[PDB]
Design a protein around this ligand. Structure first.
Ligand SMILES: COC(=O)[C@@H]1CC2=CC(=O)CC[C@]2(C)[C@@]23O[C@@H]2C[C@@]2(C)[C@@H](CC[C@@]24CCC(=O)O4)[C@H]13
Length: 244
């Protein structure tokens, strides 16, 4: 099918600034609009990364779009946990160098509980001493973790790619290694529940954005308008390593 982990380490997207205006009041609307703007900028980086991801090009365009749209909150939250771990030892939420959340910002954002939920994942990175090589493979697995309930256009092509990256994770964890592999698959599975709550809040603010004064960039409007009716109608199928 394929040293893909070496390629993953090298294609990691660069630093994305939030463009946070600290001279503006820290209302929920101002913080959430900055977070949405940062998400749009990161989503362009996700598309550029995916294009050069080994095996991703073999999937038809429709499937590439489906995977990117279904997984955007997963990839985004996992990278946030990584940045938080690497740059603050998971003491804060490192959204961007110019936007680091402390307790004050967690409360002001009107997402305190969702923020604490995120902080728990970054705290697991500390507990496990997650490595950069493990992180990069796991991020690919999150891109491939949610599919249509009736499957993709080229389901066989997708399963081959996913299976091959799971094999890369197993080779990477290796004096006993099975223990580590299951610790990593348990972490990946726990992302689906967190992502459900994050999407619930995102969908809510999207449905009445002006009413709440929350701004969405064009990129997020497009993704969310497509994703929201699919997720809410049960057309999304989260893939679990270990059925709950
Ligand atoms: C703790 O929340 C988050 O951090 C997640 C993950 C994430 C990490 C990043 O590093 C980029 C930003 C995103 C995508 C995100 O902050 C934006 C704003 C999102 C889309 C939010 C879930 C709900 C919200 C709030 C307001 C809205 O409309 O939806 C995301």
């Amino acid at each position: 099918y394929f040293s893909p982990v070496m390629v993953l380490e090298n294609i990691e997207p660069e630093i994305v600034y939030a463009g946070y205006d600290s001279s503006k009041p820290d209302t929920a609307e101002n913080l959430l609009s900055t977070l949405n703007r940062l998400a749009g900028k990161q989503m362009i980086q996700v598309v550029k990364w995916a294009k050069v991801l080994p095996g991703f090009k073999n999937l038809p365009l429709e499937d590439q779009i489906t995977l990117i749209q279904y997984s955007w909150m997963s990839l985004s939250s996992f990278a946030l946990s990584w940045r938080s771990y690497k740059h603050t030892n998971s003491q804060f939420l490192y959204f961007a160098p110019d936007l680091v959340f402390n307790e004050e910002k967690m409360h002001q954002s009107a997402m305190y509980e969702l923020c604490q939920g995120m902080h728990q994942i970054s705290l697991q990175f500390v507990r496990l001493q997650l490595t950069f090589e493990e992180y990069t493979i796991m991020k690919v697995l999150l891109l491939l973790s949610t599919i249509p309930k009736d499957g993709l256009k080229s389901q066989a092509a997708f399963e081959e790619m996913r299976t091959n990256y799971i094999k890369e994770l197993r080779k990477m964890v290796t004096g006993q290694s099975w223990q580590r592999f299951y610790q990593l698959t348990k972490l990946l599975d726990s992302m689906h529940d967190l992502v459900s709550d994050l999407l619930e809040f995102c969908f809510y603010t999207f449905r009445e954005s002006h009413a709440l004064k929350v701004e969405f960039p064009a990129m997020l409007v497009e993704i969310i308008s497509d994703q929201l009716p699919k997720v809410e109608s049960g057309n999304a199928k989260p893939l679990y390593f270990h059925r709950k």
